[PDB]
Structure 1
Amino acid sequence: SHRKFSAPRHGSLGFLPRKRSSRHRGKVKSFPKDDPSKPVHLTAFLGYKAGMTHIVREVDRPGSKVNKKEVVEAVTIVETPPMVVVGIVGYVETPRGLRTFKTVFAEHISDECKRRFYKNWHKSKKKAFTKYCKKWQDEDGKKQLEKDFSSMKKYCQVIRVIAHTQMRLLPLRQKKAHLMEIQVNGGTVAEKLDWARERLEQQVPVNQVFGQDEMIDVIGVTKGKGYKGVTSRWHTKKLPRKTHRGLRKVACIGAWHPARVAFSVARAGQKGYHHRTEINKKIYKIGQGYLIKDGKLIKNNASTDYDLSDKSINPLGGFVHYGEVTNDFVMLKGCVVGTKKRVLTLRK
């Protein structure tokens, strides 16, 4: 009784079910809430971390002792091919939470989307959306399709947008588009919805969604570390050398009279591959990649005002275990949840 020396808790109970996530792509648990006085805009965006480099920047912090000097900072870079808007989902609020009102998908959906609707694309007849694409052209299904935007406009109070990644433009061997469903948090529900009917099956770049030095939140799934014990899953102090049956164990896992092992004690299990949201990751540069073939190929990434070289942010030898970046990218100060080649949703 009364440990004689107080310590704090090892690990946080805010992340208790140290479980494999039920998803590979990071779920947005909360989009930022809107005031409809703003112009109309998206809120999240899918990205792929390729690898990390570092930087030199002239820091500006009056008061500090670093002020007007050059600092190196670790950055990650997140390759972002543009999203292609496919669907529009309505949501009506109930006293039981938000509820999906209905969904309307694009006229002709791409091939990398339709691969996401199959666990075996090879054994498939690829018969998805064949009956649904006809109602955009058949006049009887079309004059009620225009009804189901007017029923959308009347009843549902928040609408979102289904978009996906163009996986042909990546060095990954996946080719299934990651199909996300993100919220348009702009003005009123008429302007919010005719800004999404305008741009079905069209591309959305990332600089239309995000900007330079506009601090965001990164959502992803962590580096999976496997089944590890107490001293790695929870960082418990190792027992002294003289211990019989084992060093790397938590010694007392409870008292006598609660007579049950509590939830707040540490024991072995699955470490890593958890869903996390990092917060306050500032964007350092929205680079764009590899323009047109007249100026045969402008590589021209990573070319600061003081460099003026024909450099490009794909390093000398290619990104290790990723590939070679040919698309637009976002670079972010600090570490970012995930392995390399991993989907991560950047979000305001």
Structure 2
Amino acid sequence: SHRKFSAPRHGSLGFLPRKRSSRHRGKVKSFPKDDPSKPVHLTAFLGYKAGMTHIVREVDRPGSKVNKKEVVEAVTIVETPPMVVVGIVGYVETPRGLRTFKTVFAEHISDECKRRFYKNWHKSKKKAFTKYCKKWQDDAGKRQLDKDFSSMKKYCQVIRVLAHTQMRLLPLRQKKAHLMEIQVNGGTVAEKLDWARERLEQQVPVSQVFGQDEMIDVIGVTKGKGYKGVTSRWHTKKLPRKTHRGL
């Protein structure tokens, strides 16, 4: 027999493998679609959730009851120290997808970013990129690692810069700096890469990524609440008091 009383189903099936996220850093599944008309700009940034507070502002929407009245609105502070760019990576469109092509790192990268390549920074001897950084200080390597920019300016469609947070400046216990590919959306691929190889091993602040009163998207992992029950997770109806094996 059917349901006597129809009712919409609990939960959404679009978010269905409700598992622990494999990543701690929120990952951008799709950067904004590129077009060669606009000037070059980063399209993502990282920040840290500080907390919540109020706002009072005067609203200007002609038609509401709250035009030229003043609401309060909850807001969230995200501390965003300027992120240090430490590499680029290119991507070639393939019939099987979009393959990475040639990752090129900077010369001097900081040892808060070097923490990321080590599961145990104490026991290690800090040997990462030591044989790689010596390519920047000889002509045998300089003509090697600018010939590949010349191949990235031929065969890559998507150039994504490779930045990292600067966790020296944060109040946290952690020092291992998160790092992120940020897609550079701008002119041709030559302009797009000869913009970022000067941003290589230097700062990028927030104010030349975003602006005021712009809508953005927040990527991140939720506050974990543990192994919880079906009425706590899926919000199904609590069975009545009289039930024998739990309600």
Given the two structures, how large is their TM-score scaled by the length of structure 1?
0.70
- In 2, distance between residues paired with 1:213 and 1:232? 36
- In 2, distance between residues paired with 1:20 and 1:117? 23
Structure 2 counterpart of 1:48: 48
Deviations 1:154-195 (A, max 9, x none): 101110011001101000010010011110011100000000
- In 1, distance between residues paired with 2:224 and 2:81? 25
- In 2, distance between residues paired with 1:94 and 1:109? 31
Given the two structures, how large is their TM-score scaled by the length of structure 2?
0.99
Aligned length: 246
User: Structure 1 residue 55: deviation in Å?
Assistant: 0.5
Deviations 1:36-87 (A, max 9, x none): 1111111000000100001100011101011100100000010000011111
Alignment RMSD, CA only?
A: 0.5
- In 1, distance between residues paired with 2:161 and 2:35? 18
- In 2, distance between residues paired with 1:115 and 1:52? 30
User: Structure 1 residue 2: deviation in Å?
Assistant: 1.1
Structure 2 unaligned regions, length at least 5: none
User: Structure 1 residue 141: deviation in Å?
Assistant: 1.2
- In 2, distance between residues paired with 1:27 and 1:205? 20
Percent of aligned pairs sharing the same letter:
98
- In 1, distance between residues paired with 2:162 and 2:35? 22
User: Structure 1 residue 10: deviation in Å?
Assistant: 0.3
- In 1, distance between residues paired with 2:199 and 2:73? 38
Deviations 1:107-147 (A, max 9, x none): 11111111110000000110000000000002101111110
User: Structure 1 residue 21: deviation in Å?
Assistant: 0.5
In structure 2, the residue corresponding to 1:240 is in which secondary structure?
Answer: coil
- In 2, distance between residues paired with 1:114 and 1:50? 25
Deviations 1:80-109 (A, max 9, x none): 000111111000010000000011000111
User: Structure 1 residue 35: deviation in Å?
Assistant: 1.0
- In 2, distance between residues paired with 1:125 and 1:35? 44
User: Structure 1 residue 13: deviation in Å?
Assistant: 0.2
Deviations 1:243-301 (A, max 9, x none): 0010xxxxxxxxxxxxxxxxxxxxxxxxxxxxxxxxxxxxxxxxxxxxxxxxxxxxxxx
In structure 1, the residue corresponding to 2:98 is in which secondary structure?
Answer: strand
- In 2, distance between residues paired with 1:108 and 1:6? 64
User: Structure 1 residue 198: deviation in Å?
Assistant: 1.1
Q: Tell me which moved more, 11-20 or 138-147.
A: 138-147
User: Structure 1 residue 34: deviation in Å?
Assistant: 1.2
User: Structure 1 residue 206: deviation in Å?
Assistant: 0.2
Structure 1 or 2: more helix by fraction = 2
- In 2, distance between residues paired with 1:39 and 1:151? 22
- In 2, distance between residues paired with 1:115 and 1:212? 33
The 5 Å alignment of 1:169-180 reads 169-180=169-180
- In 2, distance between residues paired with 1:19 and 1:194? 41
In structure 2, the residue corresponding to 1:120 is in which secondary structure?
Answer: coil
In structure 1, the residue corresponding to 2:47 is in which secondary structure?
Answer: strand
Deviations 1:190-216 (A, max 9, x none): 000000111111100001000000110
- In 1, distance between residues paired with 2:198 and 2:165? 19
In structure 2, the residue corresponding to 1:112 is in which secondary structure?
Answer: coil
- In 2, distance between residues paired with 1:214 and 1:205? 17
